[PDB]
Scaffold this active site. Structure first.
Site, PDB file in Angstrom:
ATOM      1  CE  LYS A 117      -6.504 -44.773 -53.364  1.00 20.60           C
ATOM      2  NZ  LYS A 117      -7.954 -44.584 -53.082  1.00 20.60           N
ATOM      3  CD  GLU A 200     -11.740 -40.980 -44.290  1.00 18.46           C
ATOM      4  OE1 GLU A 200     -12.798 -41.249 -43.685  1.00 18.46           O
ATOM      5  OE2 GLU A 200     -11.599 -39.953 -44.986  1.00 18.46           O
ATOM      6  CE  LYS A 237     -11.483 -32.188 -60.349  1.00 16.02           C
ATOM      7  NZ  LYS A 237     -10.208 -32.511 -61.045  1.00 16.02           N
TER       8      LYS A 237
END
Ligand SMILES: CC(=O)SCCNC(=O)CCNC(=O)[C@H](O)C(C)(C)COP(=O)(O)OP(=O)(O)OC[C@H]1O[C@@H](n2cnc3c(N)ncnc32)[C@H](O)[C@@H]1OP(=O)(O)O
Length: 461
Positions: A117, A200, A237
């Site tokens: 990341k 964030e 998904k």
């Protein structure tokens, strides 16, 4: 030069790479665990070898040394990892290229950069592709509030836990900043005693947009437009459509150009997907998948470009335009729209738990504008609990998104899988929804629409 290819995977993706290799005139080698002995992909290859004897089957498919030994003994020149098992494993690709075989995938630096990341964020910042736009590395409550001032609201925190844990705090009212940071730090110091505080900027109801990227070793990098993977049930998904019909074409071209710029900055080779989060003309980089995706089929439908064949040809070292024959970026066509539905054994009346059992009835639809990528879903197959719940990927494509929706409804009603519960009623309810058909579906659409779970009684005489 390359004549034989081994697939280090199973299910429908192994059959897809086998079909690509047979269309490219390559011999195929399959690997299968003992529990996967009745998989379709074992018998679709020229050679099939048992791997990981005495192991758990999902551990058998992760056996690097056994797979490399099978590839060396069978005379295979290349290893295609598919997706989801070892496609992003740095050690597997390193050992495969050290054995002299060809790894059908990106380079090792791409694999470790996009497998980390921090490294992926560093590459995105180097390529001037914006991520989630905060001063995340700043660690202060005063730093948090000034971070809230400079870009804006809402603000979501990582004061709870370091890796894989999020505060997930809704911050809207100006006093809710102050008392929420107070309670967040009070809970944070008591949580685990040791960790890391990160800030964030929270994005409310974003769109998950992925751009398909192909790149050869000669430096030519093209995009194959984008897909909309916003239909997600608990960050997983469900239905992916291509292209993003909700977004304007110029904004989609801008997102694809940003993905092309990032991949050209990292010098990306072979197939890859750049993920984005899209909200009101702003897009933010999330991750790069350094492998072929499950939803590459709709990109193949709307562009007319065989992604797996291009993967193998790029692994052979061929030029993207001279030898493969892909046109320039401006000449990449948009043949229409396409919808992918992944039919699984997840029972939506049972909290989407993967059902198991023997499939007694299997009827597959077909006709105009229908693409089928079946896994192990034949009649008489026993669905083991070891592997993924996926039975078959159905793709419908048409010139207009509305006809793609109509064809998807037709094939979801025509599809007959009996013996195990499927997610087909859930998929029917989703494609019947007016948000999905309009294309304005976001990542929070499934969780904020309880009417999708009202499944009618099926008679089943
Ligand atoms: C080509 C296309 O566009 S098809 C698109 C939609 N598909 C269909 O309509 C297929 C025919 N219709 C059916 O099978 C059902 O009536 C459905 C799909 C409408 C409802 O689903 P179910 O409730 O689960 O099945 P239902 O109880 O009503 O029917 C029982 C059986 O009679 C069969 N059957 C259905 N229609 C007929 C018919 N006209 N003649 C003889 N048998 C029939 C079904 O195939 C079903 O067998 P199955 O167990 O393998 O599925």
């Amino acid at each position: 030069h390359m004549k034989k290819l081994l697939v280090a995977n199973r299910g429908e993706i192994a059959v897809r790479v086998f079909r690509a290799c047979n269309e490219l005139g390559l011999s195929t080698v399959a690997v299968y665990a003992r529990e996967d002995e009745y998989s379709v992909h074992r018998f679709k290859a020229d050679e099939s070898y048992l791997i990981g004897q005495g192991k758990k089957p999902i551990d058998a498919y992760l056996d690097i040394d056994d797979i490399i030994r099978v590839a060396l003994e069978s005379g295979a020149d290349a290893i295609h990892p598919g997706y989801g098992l070892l496609s992003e494993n740095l050690e597997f690709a390193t050992k495969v290229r050290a054995a002299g075989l060809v790894f059908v995938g990106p380079e090792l630096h791409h694999l470790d950069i996009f497998g980390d990341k921090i490294k992926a964020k560093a590459a995105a910042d180097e390529a001037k592709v914006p991520g989630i736009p905060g001063t995340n590395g700043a660690v202060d409550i005063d730093g948090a509030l000034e971070f809230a001032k400079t870009y804006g609201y809402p603000v979501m925190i990582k004061a709870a836990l370091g890796g894989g844990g999020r505060g997930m705090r809704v911050a809207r009212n100006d006093a809710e900043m102050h008392d929420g940071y107070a309670r967040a730090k009070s809970e944070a110091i008591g949580a685990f005693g040791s960790g890391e505080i990160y800030v964030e900027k929270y994005i409310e109801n974003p769109k998950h947009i992925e751009v398909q990227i192909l790149g050869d070793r000669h430096g030519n990098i093209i995009h194959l437009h984008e897909r909309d993977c916003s239909v997600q049930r608990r960050n997983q998904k469900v239905i992916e459509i291509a292209p993003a019909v909700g977004l304007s074409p110029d904004f989609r071209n801008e997102i694809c150009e940003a993905a092309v710029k990032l991949c050209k900055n990292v010098g990306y080779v072979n197939a890859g997907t750049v993920e984005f989060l899209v909200k009101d003309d702003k897009f933010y980089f999330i991750e790069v998948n350094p492998r072929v995706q499950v939803e590459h089929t709709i990109t193949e439908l709307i562009t007319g470009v065989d992604i797996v064949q291009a993967q193998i040809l790029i692994a052979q070292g061929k030029d993207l335009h001279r030898e493969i024959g892909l046109p320039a970026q401006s000449e990449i066509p948009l043949l229409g729209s396409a919808i992918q539905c992944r039919i699984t054994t997840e029972d939506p009346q049972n909290g989407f738990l993967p059902d198991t059992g023997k499939i007694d009835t299997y009827r597959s639809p077909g006709g105009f504008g229908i693409r089928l990528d079946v896994g192990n879903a034949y009649a008489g197959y026993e669905v083991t609990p070891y592997f993924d719940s996926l039975l078959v990927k159905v793709c419908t494509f048409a010139n207009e998104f509305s006809d793609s929706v109509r064809k998807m409804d037709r094939v979801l009603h025509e599809f007959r899988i009996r013996g195990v519960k499927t997610n087909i009623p859930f998929l029917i309810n989703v494609i019947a929804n007016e948000n999905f058909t309009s294309g304005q579906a976001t990542t929070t659409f499934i969780d904020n629409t309880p009417s999708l779970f009202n499944f009618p009684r099926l008679r089943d005489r």
